[PDB]
From a paper:
Here, we show that repeat number variation in predicted bacterial surface proteins is more widespread and we characterize a third rod-like repetitive region in the Streptococcus gordonii protein (Sgo_0707) formed by tandem array of Streptococcal High Identity Repeats in Tandem (SHIRT) domains. The structure of single and tandem SHIRT domains from the streptococcal surface protein Sgo_0707 were determined. We call SasG, Rib, and Sgo_0707 “Periscope Proteins” due to their having variable-length stalk-like regions that define the distance that the N-terminal functional domain projects from the bacterial surface. Taken together, these data are consistent with multiple tandemly arrayed SHIRT domains from Sgo_0707 behaving as an elongated, rod-like particle.
The structure reveals two complete domains with a very short (Pro-Ala-Pro) linker; the structure of Sgo_R3-4 is ordered throughout (residues 623 through 789). Each domain adopts the SHIRT fold, and the interdomain interface is limited; this was confirmed by comparing the Tm of Sgo_R3 (75.7 °C) and Sgo_R3-4 (76.6 °C). The similarity of unfolding curves for single and double SHIRT constructs suggests that the two domains in the tandem construct unfold independently. Notably, there is a significant twist between domains when viewed along the long axis of the molecule. Small angle X-ray scattering (SAXS) analysis substantiates the anisotropic head-to-tail domain arrangement in solution. Molecular dynamics (MD) simulations of the Sgo_R3-4 construct show that individual domains are particularly stable (rmsd <1.5 Å for Cα atoms) over the length of the trajectory (0.8 μs); their individual length is conserved during the simulation and the length of Sgo_R3-4 fluctuates only moderately around 97 Å. Consistent with the models, the Dmax that was determined using SAXS scales with the number of domains; Sgo_R3-4 exhibits a Dmax of 107 Å and Sgo_R2-8 has a Dmax of 371 Å. Like Rib, there is no evidence for significant interdomain interfaces in tandem arrays of SHIRT domains.
Author numbering: 623 to 789
Write the structure that this text describes.
């Protein structure tokens, strides 16, 4: 007689299995008759959440094997899905009463920042330039309303003020 053993591996490049997944490795099956079919023991659960994301059991490499004069070994793969991420968006406003932003200023609104981790610090993207001259006068960027904000379970939003000086 022979045994059937198990091992787990990550199927997600750059991610090692956490101990909570390794803790689910099945026990060896013992006393298997030579020439019988061995089938791997399924893990007692197929999902493990961590602070980084969720691991989900995919399958073993073989769903059975014939015992042929040696112990059998089954390799089970788990895959990782990162925890939900958030965005940081931007908006521009005029800080000059009675003056609306021209399109040339609005055209400088930064792109959204994506794939920000929960609990991370977001800092707004600075405009590509900070002055725009028009026939009427010049627009200058002042600042965003905050220098940074912690992502705490929601998208962030930064408001940038431009001021106008007439020609
Ligand atoms: Cl993890």
């Amino acid at each position: 007689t022979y045994k059937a053993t198990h091992e787990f591996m990550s199927g997600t490049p750059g991610k090692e299995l956490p101990q909570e997944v390794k803790d689910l490795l099945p026990a060896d099956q013992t006393d298997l008759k030579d020439g019988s079919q061995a089938t791997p023991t399924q893990p007692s659960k197929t999902e493990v959440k961590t602070a980084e994301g969720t691991w989900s059991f995919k399958s073993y490499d073989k769903t059975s094997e014939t015992i042929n004069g040696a112990d059998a070994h089954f390799v089970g793969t788990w895959e990782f899905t990162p925890a939900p991420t958030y965005k940081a968006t931007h908006e521009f406003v005029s800080g000059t009463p009675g003056k609306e932003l021209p399109q040339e200023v609005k055209d400088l609104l930064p792109a959204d920042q994506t794939d920000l981790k929960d609990g991370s610090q977001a800092t707004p993207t600075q405009p590509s330039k900070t002055e725009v001259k028009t026939t009427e006068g010049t627009w200058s960027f002042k600042s965003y309303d905050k220098t940074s904000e912690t992502i705490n379970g929601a998208d962030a939003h930064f408001v940038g003020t431009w001021e106008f000086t007439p020609a």
